[PDB]
Amino acid sequence: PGDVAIIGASCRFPGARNKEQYWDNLLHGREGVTFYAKDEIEVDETLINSPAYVRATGALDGYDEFDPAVFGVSDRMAAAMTPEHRVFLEASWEVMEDASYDPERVRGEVGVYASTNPQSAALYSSPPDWVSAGPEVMDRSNAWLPDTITSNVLYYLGLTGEAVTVTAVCSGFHYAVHLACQSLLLGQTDMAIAGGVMVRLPQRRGYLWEEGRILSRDGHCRPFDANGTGSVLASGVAVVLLKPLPQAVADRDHIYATVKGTAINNNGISAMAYGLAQPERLSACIAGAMQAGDVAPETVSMYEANGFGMPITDSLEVHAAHLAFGKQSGTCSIGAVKGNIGHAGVVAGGSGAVKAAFALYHRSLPPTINLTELNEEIDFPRTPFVPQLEPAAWQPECGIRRAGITALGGGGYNAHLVLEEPPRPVEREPENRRPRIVTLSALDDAAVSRQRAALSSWLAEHSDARLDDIAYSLNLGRKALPSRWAAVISTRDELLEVLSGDGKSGRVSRFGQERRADLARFRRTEDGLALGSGDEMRDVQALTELAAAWVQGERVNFEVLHADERSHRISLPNYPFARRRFWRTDW
């Protein structure tokens, strides 16, 4: 094998609070940069009136919001945690939900590899003082140190494995995915959480334009444009769940795309100015990634570029990509997502990787925006690359869909990873009509009601989703939380009816109001309560009593319920986090 599957994803970007909102924005060519009036910016009093100050930024909505009760975190600790700690932790929870894996029931080793910006931690609060070694000191250290961005995931999700934090400037996301795959291919872990986080402080802030530098003169990012003047600074987060491809296919996971190869290197002594791609070192990086995945440049029909929007930086990157593709490669779609959202720093490579992964999944090519006058110096007809001006269906003459994503940063950091479309979906056996248990749990009743509203809305969106996959994913892919709700249904239409309204019109809901469940009916197993016979697991009354016992707070062995069928994990709505704002008051 040596291929790594992306079985779950979670991200937040300017103008997008989730991946579905992110993909919909890329499809319609929307811009997520925010423009402010002078009074809306409450910092930079010395610069706000300068003619060179641009009141534009890529804002991250809810950078200060967190739901500590879901993770078991105290309010004091939530304020002590840097925004990058909270945002990445909340995204790791969501990436596990998107893959339908309950961390409490994960039997293998999970690695957490993430990249973070230490400049953000240094601006949020003063660092820990290690003059004493009390427990409150350890709490303050775990809230501030970049080293514990990955450790806190292992602790607060209940996972066991290894945690590694890397700091790689603007290539952070790729370096995390690169290192995560080494862990998987060497067999040290079974699946891996990999990603990056960037929260710029102060958040609501502009920047200062200087002639010839990477920052834009008008606040617009125009990649590959002749009139491009640079990019905008942005914040975001992107996390993916990684798993070896043969194991992901065997376990009937939900696969967005596969990672064929990754490669990293540094410009070293052959250094450039910031944003300038050195042709020899970057091309060696791109070629090494394709060599690692055994993909030929003829087969890559999408190239997601770094693309600041500077004529000189775009020319050096397209030339470096040209050296790696060769002459005989053919034609390839080129684009830069920074035109949509700006430069997201640590996670800038993640926005491009997430764009490429979803492009392979939906077999669609999103456009590159703010492109009106093509850069004549890049001479695109003499290169394999064609700027994606319009959205288009992805139907390559090659026969296979493969994409390459590049991340450039300061300090000479280079990185490139090559993705392939997921395996073709297998032929499914016809769905058996039988009563099934569906479950929803959160911390309080209001959050469960939001889960019911989100699921009924989701059912309208995805009319081709099978009912046996929904129940398998909800029952085996979500953590059992205190406030619980369940129903016993046989069709998709019955599911929509029980979810509607207050949710109490269902068979299980009326059972819980009348009497408590009789536990002598069930057999206790190592994983919880189970039904006494195989014939019992197809009786509506037996399934109804078991679900009510679960709603009452008992632990149920959901594995033995789905042992007879080979269902698939699917992507369902995430937890509806109640987002209170947390910010430190003492420096």
Add this chain to the structure above:
Amino acid sequence: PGDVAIIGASCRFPGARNKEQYWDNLLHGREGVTFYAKDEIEVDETLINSPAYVRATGALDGYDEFDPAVFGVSDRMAAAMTPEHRVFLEASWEVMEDASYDPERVRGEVGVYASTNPQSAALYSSPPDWVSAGPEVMDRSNAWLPDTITSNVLYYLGLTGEAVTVTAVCSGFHYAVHLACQSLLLGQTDMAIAGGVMVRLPQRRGYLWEEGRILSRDGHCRPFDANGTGSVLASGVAVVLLKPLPQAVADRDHIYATVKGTAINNNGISAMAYGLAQPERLSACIAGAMQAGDVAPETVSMYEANGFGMPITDSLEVHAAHLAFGKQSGTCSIGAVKGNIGHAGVVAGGSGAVKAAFALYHRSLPPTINLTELNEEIDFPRTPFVPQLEPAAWQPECGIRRAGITALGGGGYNAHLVLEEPPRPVEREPENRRPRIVTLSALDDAAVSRQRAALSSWLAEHSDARLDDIAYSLNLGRKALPSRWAAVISTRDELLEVLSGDGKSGRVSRFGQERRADLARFRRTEDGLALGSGDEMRDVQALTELAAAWVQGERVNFEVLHADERSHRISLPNYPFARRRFWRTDW
């Protein structure tokens, strides 16, 4: 009836390390602003390449230099003290020396009134933490708090009295002089140290030009000029020693000028933009100061203005002064010293007051520089004021020389003080030719040699200085320090010869090496050793043994040595401070 004499002065400004250098620069119309290359500024990385950044400032040479051993300060404490603490402490030492008063032997109550910029301390180091009450905590507080800028002077100079620190933005010097004079007129103190200190941090730094604001566009300050765009930021220190006029004449002090009146008020609800003078409030301040000293505007022939260099602010200030002078005032010379050095913040009013005092003392009017096109909007021929374009002798038709100095600041702070030339000198009796004792002491032997070189150089410049004044000032105006030197001479030429070379060619020096002084020859007084008879005080051998006893470290009553003659205190060189560099290393 309430006149206060300026009997000592000390200052440092851009381009001047002492008051003699400052007056000489004003006389020749020199500019003390410094211009830097981009690489010479090691701060403001984000602004250094902006087209609006002006690499100009009024630097204070040696802002980080200090000689803590002379004050009894430890090296640890010298690094803990803010630069404003050290600069003001060193200037207070110099101002007592300039007036020829030894703080150990001052019999009265001395008040120390100063103004400081608390923003500098907040940038130099983190503030003290009061979680405990140990002596090391108190040392850190005394090193950081602005309240102890004045207290440390009382403690380290050996004075007893009262200390008051005020913070009055750009009117700081005037408010200190105002409060000092109230202390004297109410009899709370016998003499007062008054001044201010301004050390801008970071020191070597430019500024950002913004159109229509107070900062200059080219780095030059052009007061009353039609093409003026503002001023430059400057650092400095200015301290004066104040004493009631009748007492200063009775003690034969050296009087630069006298303070006739002072007045303060605030713009209040009648507020303006920064630097803009409200005519009604500022004129009331100017008129109130002249009313306090019982001086009529017809008698004021010099007006030292605030003078930023902006056409609108210069026009409003000249209008306010016109309202206070009336129509029948006559003619008056107007100038603004900010053209020479820039805006010195807390001590900005000090630069003008010191310029006016030396103008009154030397009977000269220094020019206003950078003035090529007069502001037609002010209409100077229709006002009593005439811009002093060239240096000129001060011979007013009024008959008396009086000056008014105005200080404007942010927050609406206004201040104005009126000075008069010193009293006419009395007729001196011819100098008796007799042997006299002259003394020099410092902290180490190398500093004493610098004192001898400084004293011999001074003798060439001031050939009209009487020897009985020189000995009286050296013997009664300097602190007795461990490394000592003395000589017994009768003429100025004998003084020049013994000071020359290694300084060991005198009878006192040859006496100390051969034999020790026999103290039984002398009589003990409450203030030290004295000679047994009046006839002995004219014997060379008796005076030589007494001087040698002092060099060996004994305490000598110098009051009784000069009791028979009425000598005068004169201005002699200051201590040659060995200036080691001190800066904090931990925030």
